[PDB]
Design a protein around this ligand. Structure first.
Ligand SMILES: N=C(N)c1ccc(C=O)cc1
Ligand SMILES: [Ca+2]
Length: 223
């Protein structure tokens, strides 16, 4: 997260870190057994780390649970990033409490202008590279589809939305991938892609979660 702020320990209780010997992606806990992330985060040997603030220090609220199964969206295209969504099942149910909690799925899509909270442990610099140890947060508005399409000609599908600031300086970044965009207590977005980070006229692009609620529910129901 570039141009954001320190969230505060366990203030984003649905935020997960995906770990394969090191943090490599975010995700969102949606019930005791399932995490939503980006398909471009897919790999084998994932350990889901819940209750994290400092990802390099055991602070006392963590739950580490190995993934039993990952399900990449049937229509994920890694070239265009269309349908950039994946479900991860935990080998055991997380113990839910105030610091480890699920986030609600939307019942309808969010509108341009809605303020949302974007979070993760990704790069904090728009030029160089600096990875934070503690969770970073950004409050950002959803942008109009027309401005999103204008920013990224020929690249924005109906499964994507832009959020952030066209002026630059405030954005998600590398390492935030797969993490949440939460608006009025609903998971509306997943950190997906962008041209660099926090660049002028290049806002963050996010997977449009409301399109996938039916798929998420039925997948969970049978797995
Ligand atoms: N919001 C962005 N600028 C952004 C988000 C994720 C990636 C993934 O590597 C790249 C750029
Ligand atoms: Ca920790």
């Amino acid at each position: 997260i570039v141009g954001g702020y320190t969230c505060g320990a366990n203030t984003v209780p649905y935020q997960v870190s995906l770990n394969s010997g090191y943090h490599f992606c975010g995700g969102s806990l949606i019930n005791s057994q399932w995490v939503v992330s980006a398909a471009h985060c897919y790999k084998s040997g994932i350990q889901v780390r819940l209750g994290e603030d400092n990802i390099n220090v055991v602070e006392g609220n963590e739950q580490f649970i190995s993934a039993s199964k990952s399900i990449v969206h049937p229509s994920y295209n890694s070239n265009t990033l269309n349908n950039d969504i994946m479900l991860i099942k935990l080998k055991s149910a997380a113990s839910l409490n105030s610091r480890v909690a699920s986030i609600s799925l939307p019942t309808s899509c969010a509108s341009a202008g809605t303020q949302c909270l974007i979070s993760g442990w990704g790069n904090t610099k728009s030029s160089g590279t600096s990875y934070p140890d503690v969770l970073k947060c950004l409050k950002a508005p959803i942008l109009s589809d027309s401005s999103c399409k204008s920013a990224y000609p020929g690249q924005i599908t109906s499964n994507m939305f832009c959020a952030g600031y066209l002026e630059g300086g405030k954005d998600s970044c590398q390492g935030d991938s797969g993490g949440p965009v939460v608006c009025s207590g609903k998971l509306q977005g997943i950190v997906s892609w962008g041209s660099g980070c926090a660049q002028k006229n290049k806002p963050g692009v996010y997977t449009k979660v409301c399109n996938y609620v039916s798929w998420i529910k039925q997948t969970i129901a049978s797995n």
